[PDB]
Design a protein around this ligand. Structure first.
Ligand SMILES: CCc1c(C(=O)N[C@@H]2c3cc(Cl)ccc3CC[C@H]2O)[nH]c(C)c1C(C)=O
Length: 119
């Protein structure tokens, strides 16, 4: 755990994109996560006060596509940031909160064999 191997961006993309596609495939559950939260449109000006580091599927996709992840745990961390933001901000009865919980179920199943294979 002290030796950090090198990952090429195209390799990470090939390995990790199917786990992101698994999240996009969830419908309607991925719909609130396919674009960044817009607190102006949604009328929630306090959103950025509570959620200091916004994250969504389109941002994760862009970071994968543009080679911004150096290691696979940085991708896992962004996915979980998106989950934790939604669980922090939203009430437990809300569609977003429940949809988030479903995505986290899906993602944990998809990501496990991929992380084992990347090392
Ligand atoms: C509740 C506002 C919120 C949304 C959101 O996407 N809200 C709308 C929406 C909602 C649903 Cl359930 C389905 C589609 C759409 C598409 C339009 C979109 O504005 N996303 C997140 C992550 C949040 C928060 C604050 O965490």
């Amino acid at each position: 755990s002290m030796r950090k191997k090198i990952f090429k961006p195209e390799e990470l993309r090939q390995a990790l994109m199917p786990t992101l596609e698994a999240l996009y495939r969830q419908d309607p559950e991925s719909l609130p996560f396919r674009q960044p939260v817009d607190p102006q449109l949604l009328g929630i000006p306090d959103y950025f006060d509570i959620v200091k580091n916004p994250m969504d599927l389109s941002t994760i996709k862009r970071k994968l596509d543009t080679g911004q992840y150096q290691e696979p745990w940085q991708y896992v961390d962004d996915v979980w940031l998106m989950f934790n933001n939604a669980w922090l901000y939203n009430r437990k009865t809300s569609r977003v909160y429940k949809f988030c919980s479903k995505l986290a179920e899906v993602f944990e199943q998809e990501i496990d064999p991929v992380m084992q294979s990347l090392g």
